[PDB]
């Protein structure tokens, strides 16, 4: 449930997850549905990450 610039979120997600992977994550942006899809399981890291941002 992403509103606004879904591409800005992709940029932040890639930077946040890149050190953990050691490589850029593969992601899909569905601008029609408003969702961002990432290859691999990163739910816990992204859940904690989004809490810090205050969403």
């Amino acid at each position: 449930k992403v509103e606004g610039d879904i591409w800005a979120l992709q940029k932040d997600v890639e930077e946040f997850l890149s050190p953990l992977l050691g490589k850029t994550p593969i992601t899909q942006v569905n601008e029609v549905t408003g969702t961002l899809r990432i290859k691999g399981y990163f739910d816990e890291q992204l859940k904690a990450w989004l809490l810090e941002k205050g969403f």
Partner: protein
């Protein structure tokens, strides 16, 4: 079936070409020991390129502009 004159020559010509091929394969520039490892780096990188493409498959992005551009089919002169 007697073998023709032209047939016999064409085989000989090919044999001479292969005979020379023997000579040029008889003088290796490097020995077996010296060969080991001289191309390791290039081989290592090449496989990484192969793996990277294989493991990078994922669906494509979807844009609103594609869906909304369909409305232009009813574009008109006012």
């Amino acid at each position: 079936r007697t073998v023709s004159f032209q047939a016999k020559e064409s085989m000989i010509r090919r044999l001479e070409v292969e005979a020379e091929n023997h000579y040029w394969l008889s003088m290796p520039y490097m020995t077996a020991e010296q060969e080991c490892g001289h191309a390791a780096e290039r081989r290592a990188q090449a496989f990484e390129a192969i793996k990277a493409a294989a493991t990078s498959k994922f669906p494509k992005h979807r844009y609103i502009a594609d869906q909304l551009d369909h409305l232009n089919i009813s574009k008109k002169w006012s």
